[PDB]
Structure 1
C-alpha cells in the first residue's frame, strides 16, 4: 500500500490507510525514540494562517471551495486581522467549527453523534449573571426531562489585553468533596480543590456525599461570582439493582448530564475559553470510574461485602464481580428513570460505525486507543481489536490552565 500509517483490525483482518493525519498542523507528545501515548496531559501571521485554513475547511464543507464567496471571506478575515489584530466568526462558521471540534476529539467514543449538536451562540454575554442564565438554559435544553440532547454554549472569545470568560468548575454538575479531620474525604475526592475554592468565595458547605456544587463564573477582569443551581434543574438518578434488593439501600446516585466546562474551544486561531458542552453518559464512566476508582467514591469493597464475596484473595475475582453489578445498576436505574444512557457495548459498536463513516468521508479518524477502550470488559468490545492513529486536528477542544 501507500506511505501513510497502515491501520489494522485484528478481529476482522481488514486494513485501512489513514491519509487524514496529513492535515494535522500540531505535534503530539511522541517522537521516533519513545511513545508517550498513555500520557493524560501531552499571534500576527500565525493567526492568519490558522484562520485561512479554517475558512478553507468551512467553504469546502459547503462545497463552495474556490467560489467568489470563499475568496471574499478570506479577504474579509485578513483585512479584519490587519486592522484589529483579531477577527470574528459568522454564526454558521461557529456552528461548523464547534461540530468539527467534536468530530476531531480523539478521546470521545460518542462521535457517531457529531453532526447532531445544538450550538448556542452566547458571544453577546457581558456579565457573570448572564453567563449563569445562558448556562441554566443550556442545562434545561440539554436535559430535556431525561431525553438528553447534545449541546454547547459558546461565550465571547479571548481578546488581546482583556480578561477571559472562565467557568471555574470542571463540569456543570459536580459533587462536593469535603476533606475530613482524619484526612479521608466525604463525597467526591476529585472535587476537593473546587469545593475549597467555593467555600473561600463564600459558599456555605453541606456535609453529604452528593452535595451539588455551586458554579464559580468569571467575567473578564472580575473576581468569579458564585451561583447555586436550582435543584429542580439538576436531574439525578438514584441507583438500584434489578435483582439485588439491598443495592438501593446504599443511597448511591449520579446526575444525568455530563457537561464539560473547563476546556478551550479553538476555531481558526480564535480561542473560546468558556464553551461548555454536554452529551449523555456511557455507563462505565459512572459505574466503573466514578464509583469504583480507588481515588474516587471507591465503593468496590462495600459492594463486594454486600454480595458476600471473598475480598481476601485477588483470585476470587471479587473486584470484577462487584464492578459488573455496579455497572448493571447504573444501566437499570437510568433506564427505569428514562434518562438517556448508553452501555459500553452499544457505544463501541457505534464508534466502529463512526470509524467506517470517517474512513470514507475524510480518510481516517484521530483516536486515542487508551481512552476509547472502556475500563471494564475491554477485549469484549470491538474497539479493543482496532488499531488507532492519534493526532491533533483543528478545530479542537484543548485543556487550558486553571484560572487561579
Structure 2
C-alpha cells in the first residue's frame, strides 16, 4: 500500500511510492511503533551480487545510459569479480554517485537540499594511520575553506573478509575533551568523556580547559590505533558573543566551525566503508540548543538565565525558553560576525520543505525521520512540524556501527 502524506498547514496531500524500494526492514511492526528510538536493537555471494546489480542499475539509470553496452559490460565485470574473489570494487565515478545518494537517502538529515553538491575524496589507496591523518587534514582544510564551508566526504578503504576495519575512533573530526573530575562532575564536554579517556590511555597529554580539541585515534586494519594531534591553525573556532548582551562574551564560550562525522559506516552496492568521514555546515540549533543547553552536554542554561537576571525559582517564568533563545541568537550572530557558514532552523527547514517537493517529483517520495527533522526549539514555528513524513531505509546508506574498542 502507498501511504498518503498530508501537510496540515496547507491541506496538501501526496502519496509516497518510493518506500516500495526499501529492501531493509526498520524497527516498527503493526503491533508497535518504535520510531522514536535512536538505535536499532539489532546494531555470502548471492546477496552481495543482487545489491551490486541493483546499485549498478541505479548508476546507469542516473547517467541515463540504462541498458547500454557500457552498462552490460559493467554488470559482467562485477558478476565476474564477486564470482571469484567474493567481493568487487567500485569505479571512482560510481563511488561519487553512491556517496551523494547515501546523503540523499539519510532520513535524519535536514540539509538534504544540498545533496547534489558534495566534494568526494577518494582515499581507498590508504594503508596506514599516517596516510589517514594526511587525508583527514586535507579534508578539513578543504571543507573549512576560510569560513566558506563546503560539503565533503573522504572514503577510506572498504571492509574486507579477512581483516580488521579501517576506523576513526572519534565520533567527529573535531570534538572537545571531557575530563571526569574526582567529585563526579565533568570539565568540558560530557559526551566525550570516554574518548577523552581513550586518548590519555594512548599517551596524549591532556589539558584542563572546557574547549580542548581532542586528538585523533586512527586505526589501520588489526593494528593498535594511533594518536594524531590536529594542527591548531586547521581547526577554525568561533568565539561566542551576543549582539546586545555584553557580559555574554565574558562567559568564554566557543564552538568549532566544522561538523564532521567520522564514526558512521557508508554502504554502497553491498560494499561497506567503515571509515568515510563527512561534513557540511552547522544548523545553529545543533550548537545553541543541544550542545550547549542539553543537561548531559555543557548544560549552560542556569548560568545564562542568572546572567539575564531571570527568575530561576519556577518553571512558569519560562527562563529556560528565554535563555535558550539568546544562546541560539548568540551563535548565529557570532558565526555571521566571523564570516563562517551557518544556517538557522527556520531557513534550514524552509529549504527542507523545498527538498521534499523536489524529491516528490523526482522519485515519488522522500524518507524522513520526523523527530530528527523537526528542530529542538520552536518545532511548530517551523514548517516541518506540520508536515507528515514516511520513514524507511534506502541504499546507498549511512549506518551506525559498533565502537571499535
Cα distance in 2, alignment partners of residues 199 and 182 from structure 1: 19
Per-residue CA deviation, residues 338-362 of structure 1 (Å, 9 max, x unaligned), is 0000000000000000000000000
Alpha-carbon offset, residue 69 of structure 1: 1.3
The SS at the match of 1:305 is helix
How do residues 357-372 of structure 1 correspond to structure 2 at under 5 angstroms? 357-372=358-373
Task: Give the counterpart of 2:39 among 35, 38, 41.
Answer: 41
Cα distance in 2, alignment partners of residues 133 and 62 from structure 1: 32
Q: Which residue of structure 1 lines up, in the alignment, with residue 226 of structure 2?
A: 225
- Structure 1 unaligned blocks of 5 or more: none
The SS at the match of 1:204 is coil
Q: TM-score, normalised by structure 2?
A: 0.99
The SS at the match of 1:198 is helix
Q: TM-score, normalised by structure 1?
A: 0.99
The SS at the match of 1:141 is helix
Please identify, of 69-78 and 296-305, the stretch whose mean Cα deviation from structure 2 is larger. Answer: 69-78
The SS at the match of 1:359 is helix
Alpha-carbon offset, residue 310 of structure 1: 0.6
- Please identify runs of 4+ aligned residues in structure 1 that moved more than 6 A: none
Q: Which residue of structure 2 lines up, in the alignment, with residue 164 of structure 1?
A: 165
Q: Cα RMSD over matched residues?
A: 0.5
Alpha-carbon offset, residue 48 of structure 1: 0.3
Per-residue CA deviation, residues 308-333 of structure 1 (Å, 9 max, x unaligned), is 00111000000000000000000000
Cα distance in 2, alignment partners of residues 324 and 10 from structure 1: 26
Per-residue CA deviation, residues 81-113 of structure 1 (Å, 9 max, x unaligned), is 001110000010000000000000000000000
The SS at the match of 1:37 is coil
The SS at the match of 2:87 is coil
Cα distance in 1, alignment partners of residues 180 and 222 from structure 2: 31
Alpha-carbon offset, residue 292 of structure 1: 0.1
How do residues 1-400 of structure 1 correspond to structure 2 at under 5 angstroms? 3-42=1-40, 43-400=44-401
Cα distance in 2, alignment partners of residues 5 and 202 from structure 1: 54
The SS at the match of 1:145 is helix
Cα distance in 2, alignment partners of residues 226 and 191 from structure 1: 16
Per-residue CA deviation, residues 212-244 of structure 1 (Å, 9 max, x unaligned), is 000000001110000000000000000000000
The SS at the match of 1:216 is strand
- Structure 2 unaligned blocks of 5 or more: none
Alpha-carbon offset, residue 46 of structure 1: 1.0
The SS at the match of 2:187 is strand
Alpha-carbon offset, residue 162 of structure 1: 1.5
Cα distance in 1, alignment partners of residues 369 and 73 from structure 2: 38
Cα distance in 2, alignment partners of residues 53 and 200 from structure 1: 44
The SS at the match of 1:266 is strand
Alpha-carbon offset, residue 287 of structure 1: 0.2
Alpha-carbon offset, residue 125 of structure 1: 0.6
Cα distance in 2, alignment partners of residues 72 and 162 from structure 1: 30
The SS at the match of 2:248 is helix
Cα distance in 2, alignment partners of residues 158 and 208 from structure 1: 37
Cα distance in 2, alignment partners of residues 202 and 52 from structure 1: 46
Alpha-carbon offset, residue 163 of structure 1: 1.1
Per-residue CA deviation, residues 178-235 of structure 1 (Å, 9 max, x unaligned), is 0001100000000000000000011111100000000000001110000000000000
The SS at the match of 1:186 is strand
Alpha-carbon offset, residue 159 of structure 1: 0.7
The SS at the match of 2:272 is strand
Alpha-carbon offset, residue 64 of structure 1: 1.2
Cα distance in 1, alignment partners of residues 315 and 280 from structure 2: 36
Query: How many pairs align?
Result: 402
The SS at the match of 1:334 is helix
Cα distance in 1, alignment partners of residues 169 and 70 from structure 2: 40
Per-residue CA deviation, residues 67-92 of structure 1 (Å, 9 max, x unaligned), is 11111111110100001110000010
Cα distance in 2, alignment partners of residues 292 and 123 from structure 1: 39
The SS at the match of 2:50 is helix
